Each structure stands twice: as C-alpha cells, then as structure tokens.
Amino acid sequence: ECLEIFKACNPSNDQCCKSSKLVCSRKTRACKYQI
C-alpha cells in the first residue's frame, strides 16, 4: 500500500508507490510526497 499521507513505511515491506513521489527514506520512517 502506498503511503502518501506520511504513514509509517516498512523497511522491507515495500509500501510507498512506484511512480509516486511519496518518499520514506529521505524523511522519517513515514512515507509522504516531497514538498
């Protein structure tokens, strides 16, 4: 599941989308689109 709202992203369990900008590494464990 893609976490663009900034939901806690998993280290192995690929959550964030692909083409989506929602990043989880750059920011906290949470995955959210890059401002």
CA distances from 28 to 16, 21 (A): 13, 15
Of 13, 12, 11, 6, nearest in space to 33 by CA: 6
The parent domain of residue 33 ranges over 1-35
Ramachandran angles phi, psi of 32, nearest 5°: -145, 150
Q: Where are the beta strands (DSSP E) in the chain?
A: 5-8, 30-32
Alpha-carbon distance of 12 to 34, in angstroms, equals 21
**Residue 2 near residue 16, CB atoms below 8 Å:** yes
Token code pair at residue 15:
């959550």
Compute the residue count for the chain: 35
> Domain count of the chain?
1
- Give, in degrees to the nearest 5, the angle at Cα 13 between 21 and 17: 20
